[PDB]
Design a protein around this ligand. Structure first.
Ligand SMILES: O=C(O)C(=O)CC(=O)c1ccccc1
Ligand SMILES: O=C(O)C(=O)CC(=O)c1ccccc1
Ligand SMILES: O=C(O)C(=O)CC(=O)c1ccccc1
Ligand SMILES: O=C(O)C(=O)CC(=O)c1ccccc1
Ligand SMILES: O=C(O)C(=O)CC(=O)c1ccccc1
Ligand SMILES: O=C(O)C(=O)CC(=O)c1ccccc1
Ligand SMILES: O=C(O)C(=O)CC(=O)c1ccccc1
Ligand SMILES: O=C(O)C(=O)CC(=O)c1ccccc1
Ligand SMILES: [Mn+2]
Ligand SMILES: [Mn+2]
Ligand SMILES: [Mn+2]
Ligand SMILES: [Mn+2]
Ligand SMILES: [Mn+2]
Ligand SMILES: [Mn+2]
Ligand SMILES: [Mn+2]
Ligand SMILES: [Mn+2]
Ligand SMILES: [Mn+2]
Ligand SMILES: [Mn+2]
Ligand SMILES: [Mn+2]
Ligand SMILES: [Mn+2]
Ligand SMILES: [Mn+2]
Ligand SMILES: [Mn+2]
Ligand SMILES: [Mn+2]
Ligand SMILES: [Mn+2]
Lengths: 183, 183, 184, 184, 183, 183, 183, 183
């Protein structure tokens, strides 16, 4: 599952935390660690290099190395990862959620901001949101085209440790009104 | 659990659906049915009459029946329920979610919009967001004052049937891009 | 349809117009006259008194004459007409359009702005957009409750005069870019 | 008009639809098919190659093949078609509508977004909105310059299939409030 | 013409001013004094009490003294003046300008903000912008209805002193870039 | 200067703090405690009842008790204090600052939002922002009308403890970027 | 004065007009004709080629003809004219108005939008708004630098014919409410 | 501390001033002169070339002179200063303030607007806000990377003259409401 160091460090933060604002930072850090764990494991299953928040401009420079980085009109986005295969650019973002809400938002943004550069480079740019539902552990991938390339992806993992750390956090701060409504 | 008839109605809808948009509608309707199921069971545990989206003006008329409804300067919000006890008005919203995000949004809006009416009536107005985490089944209530009013509140239920209906929906529409990215 | 004198007024204006801005005001007046024509005929069919743009506050004073208009918290809208029967207030707006866009705008505005006053008065307020598609001439009415009151509505009319005058206007101003791209 | 198989696809969808959201997507697909049908026929009449939604950058690369598409400062629009003759770039958009509203929106956007690139290239860029009113079937074209090139444009078509299918849809969904008040 | 005190005081300010920001304040004060001079002279010709920036609420209380000032929903506008005759409320604003721009803005605002209260009181509210062109000295009045009541208004005045003071200001500060573009 | 028990609490908080977010809350609480200290001392000098954040509606009911709090159209603002003397309502806010910026923002808001209720009650409402510069200890009051009532105000007080507590805080967290740039 | 043919064209338009909107169009067109007449006469006095609304990119190409017009990052403004002298670019707009309002608006926009291009080209860009007051006939130029470049600039003209055309318009439409309040 | 000639000029300005608007300009100029004084002294301590408001584009051309200033996509910002050392670009702004508010606003803006140009040049860009608290004279710098380069910075300076000039100003204009509430 998750790294046993990372686990023990979360446990230490929970145990030493006394203030709602510190607790909320742990809550938020748990969610980002969970997303990143999924990303690393997903990339092992797809057999691709693990990346995080890649500047779009670096993606263009990798796929069309003729491009001049000083001038090219690249959108200001940092997707989790990408794959360029058979002259199709797949732009990948990882998500861990019980809902498709965050996926639709990322999708609409990435799709909209990549149209112009797709037309300039004459390269189709496919936006691929790869989401795992943390309760069912099912994978949901919007892109039919990406799924033809990878028709059977198995990411055999679970989120039980994140669940347990979160329950420990709420065990300790569950009657602090500031924590319960902290952004 | 949920009424057996509500269940079978959802099954028939899922079985007869063929389009992404109908499927997303079912998905949204399962979430509202789940919220309302939690509401009914919560209300039994609080020993209050089950209500849903009560016009604020009707609240005022119940608690101060001499008020002229044509003329009172009052907010236009529709909370799930309320409780008026010892001259304190508790405004209640039910939530089912694994995070606090929707709770903070409703709390901020309800709190901000009831300050003035609270001064005019000379009635303290406490905003009580009652959330159940559908995975852990833990109950989180922001308001210390409400929690002091009650003995330990236990709502011992699960959402397994909603989970199962959702899995059927995804077994049938899980490879439909329009569904996976539908709002 | 519209009476001869109205038709001839439009014919005269179209004949004398030489400028895009004048032509556009004619375009807009024709759509207005079409709407009001439908309204008159619709009301004959429903056997209700014809009205246009009634201030909401007058509606409330008609149905609840004891309300004080100086003090009531009530919305500022002016729907085409209304019907108060069996303690239900139906707020009616007429539309003539091949599309539902204008209906949705009016519906959302009126629905949203009447919720609070519905609660204050304890009178359900039903928003009824009665639209006629002027090509097909089918009537489209959103309100099921209203249609239970009036399940058989026939309005046997036509808009040929309005179509003919608009077609004549766009012909006369067909090489006037300013007119062709002018907004209301 | 549209070919049998297209007509029958719409008939099938309308027949199987039971939900407002499905019905609305049909409404919208019918308007799209009507637009594309006009576009195809219009282009036969003008004797130009039929196109739909051409990226502006491809237009520039067709007319000025030495431009570098990675570096040019150029707008991101996708007009229906274009014509480059006598060193004038005509940017064409097709419209089918009884109103000029949609034309004015497209016109203003394209005009405004193409001024700078017109200056950069030293090529006048003429925005041509070709609209057909589907009731009257008159053609309305804003551009005088374009009309000097094509003073005699005849597109002898009709939209009866589209009207009939829409009328059938609104009949089937005529007591569905959600459909009647649903937006695109 | 303008009061000879007021004149001499403007002249003193011009003569003592050394900074662009003080000068601009004189410019602005000249224009408001000119407007007010016109207002006073206009009111002599119409034979009505001179008023300036009347709270709308005071207007309602004068024409319908039954109204309760604590509750009535009065628009937040302060027109220069008003006349209530034959159950018509004329809301008057003075303008001195070579253009109708400021008139259209005031008209659109006053017209829009007075519709609801017109309907509540059942009193037509006519908005009357009375403008004098300071160069031709012609009077322009939008309201046909107001002009039937006052078919021949003569305001026999001129603005030569304001013109002269302004030219003196520009004589002194005409090469100060800060003054010339000061708001 | 400040209450000794209050000082001790602050010292303890600073000593036990280990996190930027906790430290920033101390920084904020120090600023509000300084504002409130100034307020108490100011109200002693002026011989007025000490208040803090009074809802406008309560001000109205105090000065005009015949008003119906359920119907009156009144602004929703919460100034620090007020003084009603000779049928003039002075609305008071305390400020502690080296700049007039916060004063202007409070002034502009209170002034604008009290014009209508001034008209409705026929009571002049004067906005009085009373600022002490915590370095020079000079008192600055915008309102000449208020200063005619109170021509010599001496609040002979000291903010050295607030300065010292703040310096302790900045010596523990002075190398924490999260703290230095915390909002 | 203005070309005799332009004059007679305006007369015919005024004589054949019957609608408020046509009349306002004439009014707007008289103002633009007046601006452009001032422009032509100003340019003769400055000894520069008459121009109107010059694309900024054409300016850059004239002054730096090696610049690649496809690629230069430049603002999209359309000033009335310009003068490039001793490596200083003077951006010129003509104004006819009795106040500075329209001048401040154009100056702020032109100044803000040319800062970046000025840095990139390494060319100072001075924004020169040249306004004639149509009543006093005085000439006001904001820019000291431009005024230092030139001998005293005299543009000795009047706008009497525009005044007379405007009076004819108002003799015919002065009692038409739609005209008086038309934008 | 500050240049003696500069001091004298300020004293003269304060003595000859009679108007709120002129006084407020002095107040502003005093604050900018204090900021610039701090800047000069700071740059002496750090042994860096004193600069003020450098356009970003000039920074780029200094550090990477092969870039084409006409084509490079670069932010339009004007930080106070910079340091390019070991292929790391430190963007510096000087602040004089008792609060971190202005620092956070400058930081957030510079950070956000330099991310893309960092990617394009492959040069890390660190945002360095250097604030001196004018009361405590303590120096606060957000950037740990910058402080690793410069572990001991002593700017041993004094703002007493600025404080004294400000007090003179507030003793001449302390009873002028227009001044006290001037922006
Ligand atoms: O949620 C995701 O799936 C992300 O990929 C998030 C991400 O990059 C991010 C960016 C800025 C702040 C926090 C998360
Ligand atoms: O999410 C909840 O907890 C609600 O209580 C939702 C609800 O009432 C609602 C109904 C219609 C529109 C928006 C919210
Ligand atoms: O379109 C309709 O159906 C109307 O009923 C329109 C109407 O009353 C109106 C009149 C003037 C301005 C805005 C709307
Ligand atoms: O309406 C038209 O005339 C279009 O040409 C529309 C069109 O291309 C389009 C397609 C998808 C989204 C927005 C516009
Ligand atoms: O221009 C007019 O005609 C006015 O009537 C103006 C007016 O009341 C006013 C209000 C606030 C500030 C300055 C002028
Ligand atoms: O700054 C002041 O002078 C205040 O009087 C502030 C105040 O009331 C307040 C209100 C809400 C939150 C925190 C402070
Ligand atoms: O007023 C001026 O001085 C102009 O120079 C105006 C002008 O060019 C213009 C043209 C079209 C739209 C907006 C302004
Ligand atoms: O406040 C600072 O720290 C500045 O560095 C400010 C600055 O550059 C500036 C820019 C424009 C106008 C006035 C000051
Ligand atoms: Mn990411
Ligand atoms: Mn992600
Ligand atoms: Mn609810
Ligand atoms: Mn709820
Ligand atoms: Mn109407
Ligand atoms: Mn209508
Ligand atoms: Mn298209
Ligand atoms: Mn099209
Ligand atoms: Mn006024
Ligand atoms: Mn006025
Ligand atoms: Mn306060
Ligand atoms: Mn305060
Ligand atoms: Mn121009
Ligand atoms: Mn100009
Ligand atoms: Mn600076
Ligand atoms: Mn600085």
């Amino acid at each position: 599952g998750m790294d046993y160091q990372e686990y023990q460090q979360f446990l230490a933060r929970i145990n030493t935390a006394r203030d709602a604002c510190v607790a909320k930072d742990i809550d938020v850090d748990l969610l980002m660690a969970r997303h990143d764990y999924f990303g690393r494991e997903l990339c092992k299953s797809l057999n691709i290099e693990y990346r995080n928040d890649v500047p779009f401009i670096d993606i263009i420079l990798d796929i069309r190395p003729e491009v001049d980085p000083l001038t090219i009109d690249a959108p200001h986005i940092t997707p989790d990862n990408y794959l360029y295969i058979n002259n199709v650019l797949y732009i990948i973002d990882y998500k861990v959620s019980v809902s498709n809400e965050s996926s639709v938002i990322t999708y609409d943004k990435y799709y909209e901001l990549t149209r112009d550069i797709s037309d300039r480079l004459s390269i189709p740019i496919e936006i691929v949101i790869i989401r795992i539902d943390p309760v069912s552990r099912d994978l949901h991938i919007n892109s039919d085209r990406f799924k033809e390339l990878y028709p059977t992806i198995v990411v055999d993992i679970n989120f039980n440790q994140f669940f347990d750390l979160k329950q420990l956090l709420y065990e300790k701060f569950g009657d602090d009104e500031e924590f319960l409504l902290k952004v």
